Structure 1
Amino acid sequence: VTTNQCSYSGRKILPGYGKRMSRHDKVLLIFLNRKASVHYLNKWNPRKIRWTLASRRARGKEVIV
């Protein structure tokens, strides 16, 4: 089906889930759940949150193409 990738983590989002946010520099952000949206607003660094795509990439556990 048509899918999106969470902008905070790297997960896939299925039709009818999560919510979007329109930033004022004219950039859109797509969130998987409310947990992911609270992490972004508080300015918690994605690489320090160990379950994200960004963390596992920085830890060698995720292969970067």
Structure 2
Amino acid sequence: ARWNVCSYCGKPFEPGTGKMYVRNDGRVLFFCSRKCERYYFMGRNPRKLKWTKAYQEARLQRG
């Protein structure tokens, strides 16, 4: 009964949903949906899409 946080959009998702991906180095990434997972692996930059939490950080970085 804990809300994991997506590694791409940075938002929490409800229990019983999403998935956890394990890297060969032991790093674990939580994906709330196939959309987020596919974008992450494709390489689309999360910091240019307004519907992600990284966009606010990018806006702060650029002022």
Does the alignment reach a TM-score above 0.5? Answer: yes
Aligned length: 60
- Normalized per residue, which structure has more helix? 2
Q: What percentage of aligned pairs have identical amino acids?
A: 42
Gaps of 5+ in 2: none
RMSD: 1.2
Gaps of 5+ in 1: 61-65
Structure-2 residue corresponding to 1:22: 22
Aligned partners of 1:25, 1:49: CA distance in 2, in Å?
Answer: 28
Q: Given the two structures, how large is their TM-score scaled by the length of structure 2?
A: 0.83
Moved over 3 A (4+): none
Deviation readout 1:20-42 (Å, 9 max, x if unpaired): 11111110000011110011010
Deviation readout 1:1-48 (Å, 9 max, x if unpaired): 411111111100111111111111110000011110011010111101
